[PDB]
């Protein structure tokens, strides 16, 4: 999948999480989001296409996904413990990090 597919996967599963009826449903969407984040971490966003692959911008882009995954992994901990509401609030914490990378690189 390309970066656009990964973003729609992140967007769709965040909506799945918000509408979920139990924590296993949240757990399942979070794992799909984890996969999509690591995949997206390997892409070059179009705005940075003529930057060096070693550029500070490209490393900042990749590191935004590391922090997103960290957050996804914390939400997964709550989902595995059966705490549906806390895991959902944990998933909402992702949104500002989605937004901060978009502001720089969308
Ligand atoms: C950088 C570390 C990002 C993080 C974290 C998130 N997104 Fe993102 N997103 C990013 C880029 C560079 C782009 C442009 C994609 C392109 O190919 O030009 C996007 C785009 C989106 C979109 C629009 C996709 C499209 O059809 O063009 C969506 C819906 C989207 N992003 C959602 C999204 C969500 C929900 C995130 C947090 C879970 C998130 N993104 C994080 C870069 C980054
Ligand atoms: V954070």
PDB file of C-alpha atoms and ligand atoms in Angstrom:
ATOM      1  CA  UNK A   1       0.000   0.000   0.000  1.00  0.00           C
ATOM      2  CA  UNK A   2       1.031   3.614  -0.629  1.00  0.00           C
ATOM      3  CA  UNK A   3       0.902   6.538   1.794  1.00  0.00           C
ATOM      4  CA  UNK A   4      -2.634   7.536   0.800  1.00  0.00           C
ATOM      5  CA  UNK A   5      -3.951   4.008   1.493  1.00  0.00           C
ATOM      6  CA  UNK A   6      -2.220   4.024   4.873  1.00  0.00           C
ATOM      7  CA  UNK A   7      -3.817   7.356   5.769  1.00  0.00           C
ATOM      8  CA  UNK A   8      -7.315   6.211   4.863  1.00  0.00           C
ATOM      9  CA  UNK A   9      -6.642   3.077   6.921  1.00  0.00           C
ATOM     10  CA  UNK A  10      -5.645   5.220   9.910  1.00  0.00           C
ATOM     11  CA  UNK A  11      -8.685   7.456   9.413  1.00  0.00           C
ATOM     12  CA  UNK A  12     -11.161   4.589   8.983  1.00  0.00           C
ATOM     13  CA  UNK A  13      -9.961   2.583  11.962  1.00  0.00           C
ATOM     14  CA  UNK A  14      -9.925   5.652  14.203  1.00  0.00           C
ATOM     15  CA  UNK A  15     -13.634   5.961  13.338  1.00  0.00           C
ATOM     16  CA  UNK A  16     -14.122   2.234  14.007  1.00  0.00           C
ATOM     17  CA  UNK A  17     -12.519   2.733  17.426  1.00  0.00           C
ATOM     18  CA  UNK A  18     -14.797   5.658  18.274  1.00  0.00           C
ATOM     19  CA  UNK A  19     -17.907   3.638  17.398  1.00  0.00           C
ATOM     20  CA  UNK A  20     -16.665   0.354  18.882  1.00  0.00           C
ATOM     21  CA  UNK A  21     -18.887  -1.614  21.245  1.00  0.00           C
ATOM     22  CA  UNK A  22     -16.124  -3.521  23.066  1.00  0.00           C
ATOM     23  CA  UNK A  23     -12.379  -3.433  23.632  1.00  0.00           C
ATOM     24  CA  UNK A  24     -11.584  -6.327  21.302  1.00  0.00           C
ATOM     25  CA  UNK A  25     -13.105  -4.235  18.509  1.00  0.00           C
ATOM     26  CA  UNK A  26     -10.831  -1.376  19.604  1.00  0.00           C
ATOM     27  CA  UNK A  27      -7.864  -3.745  19.859  1.00  0.00           C
ATOM     28  CA  UNK A  28      -8.490  -4.959  16.320  1.00  0.00           C
ATOM     29  CA  UNK A  29      -8.693  -1.473  14.780  1.00  0.00           C
ATOM     30  CA  UNK A  30      -5.572  -0.427  16.682  1.00  0.00           C
ATOM     31  CA  UNK A  31      -3.536  -3.308  15.230  1.00  0.00           C
ATOM     32  CA  UNK A  32      -4.593  -2.313  11.709  1.00  0.00           C
ATOM     33  CA  UNK A  33      -3.539   1.268  12.558  1.00  0.00           C
ATOM     34  CA  UNK A  34      -0.195   0.058  13.872  1.00  0.00           C
ATOM     35  CA  UNK A  35       0.450  -1.797  10.604  1.00  0.00           C
ATOM     36  CA  UNK A  36      -0.601   1.242   8.565  1.00  0.00           C
ATOM     37  CA  UNK A  37       1.665   3.567  10.592  1.00  0.00           C
ATOM     38  CA  UNK A  38       4.798   1.450  10.140  1.00  0.00           C
ATOM     39  CA  UNK A  39       4.049   1.098   6.427  1.00  0.00           C
ATOM     40  CA  UNK A  40       3.537   4.862   6.087  1.00  0.00           C
ATOM     41  CA  UNK A  41       6.830   5.428   7.930  1.00  0.00           C
ATOM     42  CA  UNK A  42       8.666   3.943   4.912  1.00  0.00           C
ATOM     43  CA  UNK A  43       7.140   6.286   2.328  1.00  0.00           C
ATOM     44  CA  UNK A  44       8.300   9.636   1.071  1.00  0.00           C
ATOM     45  CA  UNK A  45       5.477  12.180   1.382  1.00  0.00           C
ATOM     46  CA  UNK A  46       5.006  14.193  -1.820  1.00  0.00           C
ATOM     47  CA  UNK A  47       5.938  17.480  -0.137  1.00  0.00           C
ATOM     48  CA  UNK A  48       9.370  16.050   0.751  1.00  0.00           C
ATOM     49  CA  UNK A  49       9.957  14.253  -2.553  1.00  0.00           C
ATOM     50  CA  UNK A  50      12.972  16.376  -3.500  1.00  0.00           C
ATOM     51  CA  UNK A  51      14.523  16.360  -0.024  1.00  0.00           C
ATOM     52  CA  UNK A  52      17.386  14.060   0.881  1.00  0.00           C
ATOM     53  CA  UNK A  53      16.248  10.734   2.387  1.00  0.00           C
ATOM     54  CA  UNK A  54      18.591  11.552   5.277  1.00  0.00           C
ATOM     55  CA  UNK A  55      17.182  15.078   5.651  1.00  0.00           C
ATOM     56  CA  UNK A  56      16.021  16.363   9.048  1.00  0.00           C
ATOM     57  CA  UNK A  57      12.533  16.661   7.537  1.00  0.00           C
ATOM     58  CA  UNK A  58      12.494  13.019   6.482  1.00  0.00           C
ATOM     59  CA  UNK A  59      13.684  11.921   9.948  1.00  0.00           C
ATOM     60  CA  UNK A  60      11.075  14.103  11.647  1.00  0.00           C
ATOM     61  CA  UNK A  61       8.422  12.558   9.389  1.00  0.00           C
ATOM     62  CA  UNK A  62       9.543   9.024  10.295  1.00  0.00           C
ATOM     63  CA  UNK A  63       9.719   9.863  14.015  1.00  0.00           C
ATOM     64  CA  UNK A  64       6.165  11.176  14.019  1.00  0.00           C
ATOM     65  CA  UNK A  65       5.134   7.612  13.216  1.00  0.00           C
ATOM     66  CA  UNK A  66       7.247   6.214  16.059  1.00  0.00           C
ATOM     67  CA  UNK A  67       5.350   8.397  18.501  1.00  0.00           C
ATOM     68  CA  UNK A  68       2.029   7.483  16.865  1.00  0.00           C
ATOM     69  CA  UNK A  69       2.894   3.792  17.304  1.00  0.00           C
ATOM     70  CA  UNK A  70       3.869   4.387  20.936  1.00  0.00           C
ATOM     71  CA  UNK A  71       0.417   5.929  21.446  1.00  0.00           C
ATOM     72  CA  UNK A  72      -1.265   3.067  19.571  1.00  0.00           C
ATOM     73  CA  UNK A  73       0.627   0.601  21.789  1.00  0.00           C
ATOM     74  CA  UNK A  74      -0.581   2.368  24.926  1.00  0.00           C
ATOM     75  CA  UNK A  75      -4.157   2.227  23.636  1.00  0.00           C
ATOM     76  CA  UNK A  76      -3.642  -1.475  22.899  1.00  0.00           C
ATOM     77  CA  UNK A  77      -2.644  -2.125  26.522  1.00  0.00           C
ATOM     78  CA  UNK A  78      -5.991  -0.727  27.696  1.00  0.00           C
ATOM     79  CA  UNK A  79      -7.874  -2.649  25.003  1.00  0.00           C
ATOM     80  CA  UNK A  80      -6.207  -5.938  26.016  1.00  0.00           C
ATOM     81  CA  UNK A  81      -7.296  -5.256  29.616  1.00  0.00           C
ATOM     82  CA  UNK A  82     -10.920  -4.945  28.499  1.00  0.00           C
ATOM     83  CA  UNK A  83     -11.231  -1.217  29.359  1.00  0.00           C
ATOM     84  CA  UNK A  84     -13.167  -0.095  26.300  1.00  0.00           C
ATOM     85  CA  UNK A  85     -13.769   3.529  27.349  1.00  0.00           C
ATOM     86  CA  UNK A  86     -10.224   4.266  28.517  1.00  0.00           C
ATOM     87  CA  UNK A  87      -8.798   2.659  25.370  1.00  0.00           C
ATOM     88  CA  UNK A  88     -11.053   4.826  23.205  1.00  0.00           C
ATOM     89  CA  UNK A  89      -9.927   7.984  25.006  1.00  0.00           C
ATOM     90  CA  UNK A  90      -6.354   6.789  24.542  1.00  0.00           C
ATOM     91  CA  UNK A  91      -7.049   6.466  20.812  1.00  0.00           C
ATOM     92  CA  UNK A  92      -8.403  10.050  20.683  1.00  0.00           C
ATOM     93  CA  UNK A  93      -5.012  11.251  21.981  1.00  0.00           C
ATOM     94  CA  UNK A  94      -3.621  10.316  18.551  1.00  0.00           C
ATOM     95  CA  UNK A  95      -5.549  13.097  16.847  1.00  0.00           C
ATOM     96  CA  UNK A  96      -3.251  15.982  17.816  1.00  0.00           C
ATOM     97  CA  UNK A  97      -0.279  13.986  16.549  1.00  0.00           C
ATOM     98  CA  UNK A  98      -2.076  13.262  13.279  1.00  0.00           C
ATOM     99  CA  UNK A  99      -2.669  16.994  13.032  1.00  0.00           C
ATOM    100  CA  UNK A 100       0.876  18.080  13.896  1.00  0.00           C
ATOM    101  CA  UNK A 101       2.437  15.977  11.146  1.00  0.00           C
ATOM    102  CA  UNK A 102      -0.203  17.153   8.672  1.00  0.00           C
ATOM    103  CA  UNK A 103       0.586  20.779   9.494  1.00  0.00           C
ATOM    104  CA  UNK A 104       4.215  20.168   8.554  1.00  0.00           C
ATOM    105  CA  UNK A 105       4.025  17.668   5.696  1.00  0.00           C
ATOM    106  CA  UNK A 106       0.542  17.144   4.250  1.00  0.00           C
TER     107      UNK A 106
HETATM  108  C1  LIG B   1       3.292  12.097   9.582  1.00  0.00           C
HETATM  109  C2  LIG B   1       4.194  11.514  10.695  1.00  0.00           C
HETATM  110  C3  LIG B   1       1.783  11.727   9.707  1.00  0.00           C
HETATM  111  C4  LIG B   1       1.026  11.311  10.756  1.00  0.00           C
HETATM  112  C5  LIG B   1       1.382  10.892  12.207  1.00  0.00           C
HETATM  113  C6  LIG B   1      -0.331  11.163  10.285  1.00  0.00           C
HETATM  114  N1  LIG B   1      -0.397  11.549   8.964  1.00  0.00           N
HETATM  115 FE1  LIG B   1      -2.069  11.616   7.827  1.00  0.00          FE
HETATM  116  N2  LIG B   1      -0.977  12.349   6.241  1.00  0.00           N
HETATM  117  C7  LIG B   1       0.397  12.578   6.272  1.00  0.00           C
HETATM  118  C8  LIG B   1       0.821  13.033   4.972  1.00  0.00           C
HETATM  119  C9  LIG B   1       2.257  13.393   4.521  1.00  0.00           C
HETATM  120  C10 LIG B   1      -0.426  13.089   4.114  1.00  0.00           C
HETATM  121  C11 LIG B   1      -0.503  13.489   2.633  1.00  0.00           C
HETATM  122  C12 LIG B   1      -0.653  12.130   1.946  1.00  0.00           C
HETATM  123  C13 LIG B   1      -0.245  12.196   0.507  1.00  0.00           C
HETATM  124  O1  LIG B   1       0.028  11.109  -0.077  1.00  0.00           O
HETATM  125  O2  LIG B   1      -0.178  13.335  -0.031  1.00  0.00           O
HETATM  126  C14 LIG B   1      -1.493  12.648   4.975  1.00  0.00           C
HETATM  127  C15 LIG B   1      -2.803  12.560   4.586  1.00  0.00           C
HETATM  128  C16 LIG B   1      -3.819  12.110   5.369  1.00  0.00           C
HETATM  129  C17 LIG B   1      -5.188  11.965   4.931  1.00  0.00           C
HETATM  130  C18 LIG B   1      -5.667  12.303   3.505  1.00  0.00           C
HETATM  131  C19 LIG B   1      -5.338  11.089   2.637  1.00  0.00           C
HETATM  132  C20 LIG B   1      -5.666  11.311   1.185  1.00  0.00           C
HETATM  133  O3  LIG B   1      -6.627  10.671   0.683  1.00  0.00           O
HETATM  134  O4  LIG B   1      -4.949  12.093   0.516  1.00  0.00           O
HETATM  135  C21 LIG B   1      -5.891  11.466   5.949  1.00  0.00           C
HETATM  136  C22 LIG B   1      -7.404  11.138   5.960  1.00  0.00           C
HETATM  137  C23 LIG B   1      -4.994  11.290   7.076  1.00  0.00           C
HETATM  138  N3  LIG B   1      -3.726  11.708   6.683  1.00  0.00           N
HETATM  139  C24 LIG B   1      -5.343  10.802   8.323  1.00  0.00           C
HETATM  140  C25 LIG B   1      -4.495  10.634   9.405  1.00  0.00           C
HETATM  141  C26 LIG B   1      -4.868  10.179  10.736  1.00  0.00           C
HETATM  142  C27 LIG B   1      -6.325   9.832  11.156  1.00  0.00           C
HETATM  143  C28 LIG B   1      -3.752  10.160  11.492  1.00  0.00           C
HETATM  144  C29 LIG B   1      -3.576   9.786  12.986  1.00  0.00           C
HETATM  145  C30 LIG B   1      -4.138   8.378  13.317  1.00  0.00           C
HETATM  146  C31 LIG B   1      -2.663  10.584  10.655  1.00  0.00           C
HETATM  147  N4  LIG B   1      -3.138  10.866   9.395  1.00  0.00           N
HETATM  148  C32 LIG B   1      -1.356  10.703  11.064  1.00  0.00           C
HETATM  149  C33 LIG B   1       1.251  12.381   7.347  1.00  0.00           C
HETATM  150  C34 LIG B   1       0.885  11.923   8.588  1.00  0.00           C
HETATM  151  V1  LIG B   2       1.983  12.111  22.576  1.00  0.00           V
END
